[PDB]
Symmetry: C3
Subunit: 138 residues, 3 copies
């Protein structure tokens, strides 16, 4: 039981808030920055987690973006698929099914985001899904 | 422990049966209408949850279909991706990766279903995946 | 609590190792053969679970591959979406969002893998995602 607040922080000092439950064996963690809402009987708003070029390790292979993180938990999560929008520097954009994991390198957490080839360089990825990882410890 | 039966009901009085577990903090809920089966060593049958135009709020922006619901639980779920089939009025159809959440507007549960542009108007979405949401309460 | 080791075995005696937790009602199971790693600040390696033509039931309808299994647990899981790579006999390959379930036929576990049409016959599917199923018992 009850759901404890947490956060990561990115290179550019962006703060990714989450809630979790540790039950151990079991860690279940949800990002809470971008919970979509219905405004109007014609309109649902997706909110985004906005990650910029500066939050990624340069350089990138295989459209795999590594977002090194500080604080929060060190888990090897499963892969979850998400709704992405990838924003090129030329400001065209592509909707994609992305795939996200949490992983631990050195002493540190990282988010892995994997998407499809885009015809340009990337200024921003936005995650438009509400993300929850169910993790197994050890 | 053990798994309690529940249901929602749609505008057109369709009944979406599920099982759940509340452990609280934690709510884990599975839709049980469409559990696929192997009939024959050559054949697996996906079953569908069939949602019609009449179950959605008209009008729809961004290929986002809001299915207002009565009964069952009020949760803000994460987004899950699913296998959809979208059936146009002209009866062509498209397989898609859709994304589904549960959300709460006013006092009421809603299912959000988000898919890709189709070249026509929609008569039916069928969800062909077995859907389970792991939710965090509060 | 704590996470118990398990495995399935395929027709070709491939061994698919997993960890699980049974809490019952609740079974949460993770495949552990292919946990990706960061080697270098430019490189994350996806690992694959490699399933071959011989692990599937011939013949296949609807790009649905049935992998009959021995040992481990008998669950009807939800569908999870994954990163696939499908390798044709002509050795071209396609990245896809696949969908995987566990299911039980006769007395036996099966993995279901569902992907998109490919322009040829398949030698191998590789699952490149880290797969975790949260299951409800009964």
């Amino acid at each position: 039981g009850r759901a404890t607040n947490g956060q990561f922080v990115t290179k550019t000092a962006k703060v990714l808030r989450y809630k979790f439950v540790r039950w151990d064996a079991l860690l279940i963690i949800q990002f809470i920055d971008n919970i979509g809402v219905i405004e109007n009987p014609t309109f649902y708003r997706n909110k985004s987690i906005e990650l910029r070029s500066a939050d990624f390790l340069s350089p990138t292979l295989n459209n795999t973006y590594i977002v090194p993180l500080n604080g929060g938990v060190r888990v090897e999560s499963p892969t979850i698929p998400v709704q992405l929008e990838v924003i090129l520097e030329n400001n065209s954009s592509f909707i994609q099914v992305g795939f996200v994991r949490l992983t631990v390198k050195n002493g540190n957490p990282h988010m892995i985001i994997q998407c499809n080839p885009v015809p340009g360089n990337i200024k921003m990825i936005k995650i438009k899904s509400v993300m929850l990882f169910t993790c197994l410890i050890g």
